[PDB]
């Protein structure tokens, strides 16, 4: 029935003006999105024309800025690597808009799990407090994290590009393994899924304790071996912040894309996105943050 499609269109139109929905609306949206997300494999096949976008971290105005550069969400295929709930003053609107886009247009947009998309990380940061402020309870927070539990770990664009928010893992050796992992769980603190979302590329030439709490760091040789074994030509990631917004590492065998300009409103990094056409010729579009223009007591409840 198209009545729910029209209601979703109305919801998306409302969210485009940074106006969050109600508790029941978001609950129904997450329940609908879970049905289509649980039907998606751990690694998802992606059509040739697609624009891959890195972390947005709930900067909603910068997300509208991103939509201006790439294009309208239905018109242009979009692929979001992850981390769209924390370090943002508009995280709720950003994540619910992304989820609404995913349910309304499953083919035109795919969202991928990030390290930040987990109860622990979301709570130690402002997303839980944001949900409490904007709804007065943890119901919406619970629905969102339950949905995040169903997000895919990785996506594959025409078998030649590998899209994963974090990095390659020592336990993981081939894509077949990633398909095996059970992703319907909160990020394991240590394990293949953890490293898949927490790892970083570096020039130390080998697996090494990551400066971050969890995961390891993969050397150029590891990336080259992974591409040669899996026949991949390029791996796209977004976990590491890059001041440039796009970064070529490991002899162009890995690319780090950050789509959150002025990260934490303090970094002042210029963001960038990746666009893949029919010939999968990759091109990077860089953009800057969208122009911007007594509080209630914290014990008021």
């Amino acid at each position: 029935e198209k009545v729910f499609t029209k209601e979703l269109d109305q919801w998306i139109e409302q969210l485009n003006e940074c106006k969050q929905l109600s508790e029941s609306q978001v609950k129904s949206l997450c329940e609908k999105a879970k049905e289509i997300l649980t039907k998606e494999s751990n690694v998802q096949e992606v059509r040739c024309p697609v624009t891959v976008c890195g972390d947005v971290h709930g900067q909603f105005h910068d997300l509208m800025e991103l939509f201006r550069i790439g294009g309208k969400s239905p018109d242009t295929n979009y692929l979001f690597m992850g981390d769209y709930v924390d370090r943002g003053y508009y995280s709720v609107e950003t994540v619910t808009l992304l989820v609404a886009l995913k349910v309304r247009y499953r083919e035109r947009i795919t969202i991928l799990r990030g390290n930040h998309e987990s109860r622990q990380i979301t709570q130690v940061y402002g997303f839980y407090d944001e949900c409490l402020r904007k709804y007065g309870n943890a119901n919406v927070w619970k629905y969102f994290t339950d949905l995040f539990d169903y997000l895919p770990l990785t996506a594959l664009v025409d078998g030649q590009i590998f899209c994963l928010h974090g990095g390659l893992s020592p336990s993981i050796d081939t894509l077949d393994h990633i398909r095996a992992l059970d992703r319907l769980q909160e990020v394991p603190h240590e394990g293949p899924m953890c490293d898949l979302l927490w790892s970083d590329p570096d020039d130390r030439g080998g697996w090494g304790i990551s400066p971050r709490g969890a995961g390891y760091t993969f050397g150029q040789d590891i990336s080259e071996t992974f591409n040669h074994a899996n026949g991949l030509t390029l791996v796209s990631r977004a976990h590491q912040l890059v001041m440039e917004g796009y970064n070529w590492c490991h002899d162009r065998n890995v690319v780090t894309i950050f789509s959150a300009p002025n990260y934490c409103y303090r970094c002042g990094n210029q963001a960038a996105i990746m666009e893949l056409d029919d010939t999968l010729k990759y091109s990077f579009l860089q953009f800057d943050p969208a122009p911007r223009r007594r509080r209630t007591p914290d014990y008021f409840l």
Binding site: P49, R68, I69, K72, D75, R108, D278, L285
Partner: protein, 577 residues
């Protein structure tokens, strides 16, 4: 229903808040007599509560003026309201003071002189600063409807509050000084308010000096022109040179309203020099505010001396601020520099502002360029199209391909004016290449702006020139392998369909769209569905049924569910079925 009165005493915070919200309904059920006799006193004895319940109650007691039997018994709300004004938290204090200000209008003058004035006398004499802060915002509302002796007492109380040693009370008094002086008679203003304003403007803390400067504009408005040079002007001159940057910033921010309130004669002698000093201030924020307010000051200058005063005392400072190190000052100046072109005149604009314009056009700050391009229509009207083309057009074409997309967006959104002014031949000769290249730009927003620009140009220059020049290039852009440019071609066809007319659309736009329907990419397929839904009504029914029907039918069988849905929507809205 009747249980809510007991629920008011229930320990639960949220239930108490809900019962406070329902207080209007409960009181409506109780009736005026029983509400005033029992409910209102109950609230005063049990006022102590969580700050949130206090604020909610103060908001609710506002509409109680009628629920208390009307203004005859509105005094019954004065004791509960007073207790809420005492509450330490600021937000509840503001609601309480607003409620008292609203209630003050309902009271009869004898009630004000007998009940309200003693209440504010008590608030002003409260030991805690909160009472004095709340009382500071009540002298204005109740002053005019009292008697002469009461008015003198109210004035003495306000003088005592102004002379308070508590900085926060002094801040509140300075904030409400202008409002109090509005109601006050001019003779009293000369004798009593002016000393208070002078004392506040010389306070130890700049947080009070800035508020005194803020009220200075109302003080100047109330007084007659001859009194300003003797009562307020020295005070304002001292404030223009105040050490704190905040006082200088407050002077700059309200400079337009100030000079307007002082009139022309005060401005040429006591304010033009101050603005000159303010423009070259050490603090960047003060400079930014002054540069922002430069156009308004230049616009409200006396007609006789405006041109000269801008040429000699303002223009060199504008030239200096054009190359300012700070980016915010340059951006602020660039937003209102075009406003001085109409004032100065065509010859003065081309002689002085054009070099500055060119300099600001090439500036690296994106905000400076965006601000300069946005108001170029003023210069266009002032100097004509010829001088703009001779001077601005190279800058326009250079910025047409600037790195920042927003600058390109601004110039493209302004382009149709140039196209109309220069004529169709000039646009075809020199600017058509840029407009056509704007379509293949990587930024979608630029592409949308280019599509709208195309719609504006073909509606300005007619359908014939559109078909001769623009139609072919767009219909050939379809072959581009990138699907984004195919989306651009479809959007351009959609925009041009309304203006090109039925004949041209059916002749050339339709075959291209039908050919694109068979494109391999689903995104272009459903975009074609959208395009056929948009341009459907323009075409005649015969051509529709002949051509687009089996095309939308074929598209309805596409594997993509989006294409299916959009084809169904198009076939349903156009009733082609």
């Amino acid at each position: 229903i009747a249980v809510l009165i007991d629920e008011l005493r229930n320990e639960d915070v949220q239930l108490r808040l809900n019962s406070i919200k329902k207080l209007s309904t409960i009181a409506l059920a109780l009736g005026v007599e029983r509400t005033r006799s029992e409910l209102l006193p109950f609230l005063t004895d049990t006022i102590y509560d969580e700050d949130e319940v206090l604020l909610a109650l103060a908001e609710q007691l506002g509409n109680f003026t009628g629920l208390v039997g009307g203004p005859d018994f509105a005094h019954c709300l004065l004791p509960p309201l007073e207790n809420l004004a005492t509450v330490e938290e600021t937000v509840v204090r503001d609601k309480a003071v607003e409620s008292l200000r609203q209630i003050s209008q309902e009271h009869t003058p004898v009630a004000l002189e007998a009940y309200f004035v003693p209440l504010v006398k008590r608030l002003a004499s409260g030991d805690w600063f909160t009472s004095r802060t709340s009382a500071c915002g009540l002298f204005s509302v109740c002053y005019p409807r009292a008697s002469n002796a009461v008015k003198a007492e109210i004035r003495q109380q306000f003088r005592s509050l102004c002379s308070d040693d508590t900085p926060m009370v002094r801040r509140a008094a300075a904030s409400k000084l202008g409002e109090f002086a509005k109601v006050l008679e001019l003779d009293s203003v000369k004798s009593e308010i002016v000393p208070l304003f002078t004392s506040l403007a010389s306070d130890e803390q700049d947080s009070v000096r800035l508020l005194a400067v803020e009220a200075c504009v109302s003080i100047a408005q109330l007084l007659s022109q001859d009194d300003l040079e003797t009562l307020v002007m020295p005070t304002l001159r001292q404030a223009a040179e105040d050490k704190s940057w905040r006082v200088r910033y407050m002077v700059a921010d309200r400079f337009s309203e100030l000079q307007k309130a002082m009139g022309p004669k005060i401005t040429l002698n006591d304010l033009i020099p101050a603005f000159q000093n303010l423009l070259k201030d050490c603090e960047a924020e003060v400079r930014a505010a002054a540069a922002h307010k430069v156009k308004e000051l230049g616009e409200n200058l006396p007609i006789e001396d405006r041109e000269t005063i801008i040429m000699n005392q303002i223009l060199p400072y504008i030239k200096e601020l054009v190359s300012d190190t700070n980016q915010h000052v340059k951006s602020a100046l660039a937003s209102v520099i075009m406003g001085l072109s109409t004032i100065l005149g065509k010859e003065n604009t081309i002689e002085h502002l054009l070099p500055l314009f060119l300099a600001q056009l090439k500036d690296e700050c994106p905000d400076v360029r965006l601000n300069i391009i946005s108001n170029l229509d003023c210069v266009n009207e002032v100097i004509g199209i010829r001088q703009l083309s001779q001077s601005l057009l190279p800058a326009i074409v250079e910025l047409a391909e600037d790195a920042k997309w927003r600058v390109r967006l601004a110039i493209i959104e302004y382009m149709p004016l140039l196209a109309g002014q220069l004529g169709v031949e000039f646009f075809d000769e020199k600017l058509n290449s840029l407009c056509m290249a704007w379509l293949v730009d990587h930024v979608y927003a630029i592409r949308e702006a280019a599509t709208n620009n195309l719609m504006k140009l073909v509606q300005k220059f007619g359908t014939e020139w559109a078909q001769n020049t623009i139609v072919p290039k767009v219909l050939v852009m379809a072959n581009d392998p990138n699907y984004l440019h195919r989306m651009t071609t479809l959007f351009c066809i959609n925009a041009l369909s309304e203006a090109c007319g039925q004949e041209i659309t059916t002749k050339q736009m339709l075959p291209i769209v039908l050919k694109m329907a068979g494109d391999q990419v689903a995104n272009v397929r459903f975009n074609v569905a959208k395009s056929l839904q948009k341009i459907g009504p323009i075409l005649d029914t015969n051509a529709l049924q002949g051509e687009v029907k089996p095309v939308l039918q074929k598209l309805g069988q596409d594997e993509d569910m989006d294409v299916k849905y959009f084809a169904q929507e198009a076939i349903s809205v156009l009733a082609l079925a």
